[PDB]
Amino acid sequence: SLLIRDLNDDLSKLRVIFSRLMNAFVTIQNDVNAFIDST
Amino acid sequence: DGFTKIFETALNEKQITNNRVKGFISTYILSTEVKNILDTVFRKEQCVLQYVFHSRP
Amino acid sequence: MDISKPVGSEITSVDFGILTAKEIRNLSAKQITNPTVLDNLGHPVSGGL
Amino acid sequence: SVVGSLIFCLDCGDLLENPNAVLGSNVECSQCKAIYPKSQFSNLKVVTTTADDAFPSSLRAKKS
Amino acid sequence: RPSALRNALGEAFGTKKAKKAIADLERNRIDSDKLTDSAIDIVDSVRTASKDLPTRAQL
Amino acid sequence: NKMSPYELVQHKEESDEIGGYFIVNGIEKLIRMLIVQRRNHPMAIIRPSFANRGASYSHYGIQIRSVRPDQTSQTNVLHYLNDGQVTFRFSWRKNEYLVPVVMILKALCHTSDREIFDGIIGNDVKDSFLTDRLELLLRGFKKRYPHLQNRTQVLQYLGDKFRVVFQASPDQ
Ligand SMILES: [Zn+2]
């Protein structure tokens, strides 16, 4: 969370930096699920 | 995909013969795209759903 | 369970629900956002896990 | 030379493919210019036999 | 050196050659300069107001 | 090695201390024995789990548990493709590597002639299960690359795949 929490600092207080959020959103997705269900 | 990021597939040319004609009237689908869609269809069409997710009056 | 302690009520039933952002206001006492749970030195960190 | 339903040769010592999937009257070895068939291919006569082994009955138990 | 990880597919296993049908369908497209991707970066990030929520302040 | 059993009594032992077990961290432990099938013997096995994997192979198969002369083995089964070809299977890290058979039949020494066929039985050609079944696997290889005739060239396919799967050198 706190890796992707602190990226809106790097777009709104104004490329590969956009891949810091999307290819980590697949792990933001993979955060909550393996907490509940790790199939 | 199985509980991780339902996403999008494209259309053939027979779909987009029905967007060019209605003018007078693969990607991801990320987790911040399905939030606006359920804003409507759970409060627009509440009246079918007020009891079908209920087992009581 | 002892006879010297009574109980003046019971339980009748069950009810379900699903987690909404409205019921996060009064459900707790403090946020949890800091990653690790306790550092060196032996103390559990406050505002911590 | 010929065995079964298929033709080998003498110069190249080996076979060629299906003579009708490639040009009839015009065949040679598959790897060397050693044209032994002179367009007199074969008489393709193979005869096989299912040996009546997995045909169960009450009237094949009598022959046993 | 790294672009021969697609060279692990030809004479391979049966029922796990279709397990990487997920990991090719699910992975991504071009990931930079999609000609729409350059402007939707100020769509997602502007939703949240979470510039700095560090562990810096107090403990 | 050759200590007299009287001398074992001087060495804080048993009169007939058997030997054949480890002590590691205080107590005694033993590497157990374990069951395996035949070194160097073609064993037919029949189970439909051998048709479970591919496009319904068969229940058929004969195998070898071939052994190195330092006794660390591998596995070389066959599999009966119901089409009329026949394919290998290897094993590796955790990774099975099947392959057709002629491309590493006709890879050892220079046999591109009747000696491919003449090995199958020579003085009994008259069997009719033979020629209608060996000339569909041999046609199951000329489908793949007809420009492939000597063992220089037959190996060359391995250099597309087997360069970085056995971790070779880039100068090789
Ligand atoms: Zn020839």
**DSSP letters of F75-109?**
-EEEEE-TTS-EEEE---SS-----BSGGGTTTSS
Please check whether residue C48 is in contact with residue C34, taking contact to mean a CB–CB distance below 8 angstroms: yes
Encode burial over F82-97: b for 16+ CB neighbours within 10 A, e otherwise. Answer: eeebbbbbeeeeeebe
Residue bearing tokens 């000696």: F115
Cα separation, A11 vs A22, in Å, equals 14
Q: Is D12 annotated as a binding residue?
A: yes
Please check whether residue D7 is in contact with residue D19, taking contact to mean a CB–CB distance below 8 angstroms: yes
Cα separation, E23 vs B2, in Å, equals 12
Q: What SS3 class is residue F131?
A: helix
Resolution number, Å: 4.0
How buried is E57 (Cβ within 10 angstroms: 0-12 exposed, 13-18 middle, 19+ buried)? exposed
Solved using: cryo-EM
Cα separation, D13 vs D31, in Å, equals 11
Q: What SS3 class is residue F133?
A: helix
User: Under an 8 A CB cutoff, do B7 and E47 touch?
Assistant: no
Q: Which residues contact F73 (CB under 8 A, 6 or more apart)?
A: F65, F66, F67
Q: Which residues contact F9 (CB under 8 A, 6 or more apart)?
A: F15
Containing F7, the helix (H) or strand (E) segment is helix F5-10
Containing F62, the helix (H) or strand (E) segment is strand F62-64
Q: What SS3 class is residue F149?
A: coil
Cα separation, F121 vs F127, in Å, equals 10
- Output the 3-class SS for D5-29: CEEECCCCCCECCCCCCCCCCCCCC
Ordered DSSP codes for chain C: --TTS--S------------SGGGSSS-SS----SSS--STTPPPTT--
Ordered DSSP codes for E2-41: -TTTTSS-TT--STTTTTTTHHHHSS-S--S--SSTTTTH
Residue bearing tokens 């071939």: F66
Cα separation, D3 vs F132, in Å, equals 11
Please count the other Cβ atoms lying within 10 Å of the Cβ belonging to residue A18.
20
Residue of F nearest to E10 (CA): F161
Interface test with B, best of A1, A4, A19, A25 (most B CBs within 10 A): A25
Containing F142, the helix (H) or strand (E) segment is helix F139-142
CA distances from F32 to E46, F21, F29, F73 (A): 65, 10, 9, 19
Cα separation, D55 vs B41, in Å, equals 63
Instruction: Enter the tokens of residue B56.
Output: 């009581």
Please check whether residue F137 is in contact with residue F102, taking contact to mean a CB–CB distance below 8 angstroms: yes
- Output the 3-class SS for F32-72: CCCCCCCECCCEECCCHHHCCCCCCCCCCCEEEECCCCCCC
Is the minimum CB–CB distance between A36 and chain E shorter than 8 Å?
A: no
Cα separation, C23 vs C32, in Å, equals 16
The Cα of B4 is separated from the nearest Cα of chain A by a number of Å equal to 6
Name the amino acid, one letter, at B21. Answer: V
Q: Are strands F22-24 and F27-29 parallel, antiparallel or unpaired?
A: antiparallel
Please check whether residue F91 is in contact with residue F85, taking contact to mean a CB–CB distance below 8 angstroms: no
Of D1, D18, D49, the CB nearest to F128: D49
DSSP β-bridge partners for residue F87: F79, F100
Structural domain boundaries in chain D = 1-64
Cα separation, E16 vs F95, in Å, equals 10
Q: Taking the CA atoms of F16, F20, F23 and F28 in sequence, report the sign of the dihedral they define.
A: negative
Q: What SS3 class is residue F153?
A: helix
Q: How far is CA B12 from the centre of its chain?
A: 19
Name the amino acid, one letter, at D37. Answer: P
For Cα atoms D34, D40, D44, give the angle at the middle one, nearest 5 degrees. Answer: 110
**Residue of E43, B24, D12 whose CA lies nearest to F115:** D12
**What's F137's DSSP letter?**
H
Per DSSP, helices labelled H in A1-39 are: 2-5, 9-12, 19-36
Please check whether residue F90 is in contact with residue F96, taking contact to mean a CB–CB distance below 8 angstroms: yes
Q: Which residues contact F33 (CB under 8 A, 6 or more apart)?
A: none
Please count the other Cβ atoms lying within 10 Å of the Cβ belonging to residue A6.
15
Q: What is the dihedral of CA E17, E23, E26, E28, to 10 degrees?
A: -120
User: Under an 8 A CB cutoff, do E51 and A7 touch?
Assistant: no
User: Number of C-alpha atoms within 13 angstroms, CB side, residue E29?
Assistant: 11
Name the amino acid, one letter, at F154. Answer: V
For Cα atoms F102, F106, F109, give the angle at the middle one, nearest 5 degrees. Answer: 165
CA distances from F168 to D55, E8, F163 (A): 54, 15, 6
Cα separation, E7 vs C5, in Å, equals 75
DSSP β-bridge partners for residue F88: F78
Phi, psi of F28 (to 5 degrees): -100, 140
Please check whether residue F103 is in contact with residue F141, taking contact to mean a CB–CB distance below 8 angstroms: yes
Q: Which residues contact D10 (CB under 8 A, 6 or more apart)?
A: D1, D36
Q: How far is CA F41 from the centre of its chain?
A: 11
**E 1-59: CB under 8 A from C:** 53, 55, 58-59
DSSP β-bridge partners for residue F39: F65
Cα separation, C46 vs C24, in Å, equals 20
Query: Rounded to the nearest whole angstrom, what is the distance from the C-alpha of residue D7 to the centroid of ligand 1?
Result: 12
Name the amino acid, one letter, at E23. Answer: A
User: Under an 8 A CB cutoff, do F161 and E11 touch?
Assistant: yes
Cα separation, D5 vs D28, in Å, equals 17
Q: How far is CA D46 from the centre of its chain?
A: 7
Residue bearing tokens 């003085």: F123
Is the minimum CB–CB distance between A2 and chain C shorter than 8 Å?
A: yes
**What's D51's DSSP letter?**
-
Cβ contacts below 8 Å, chain D against chain F, sum to 44
Cα separation, D63 vs D61, in Å, equals 6
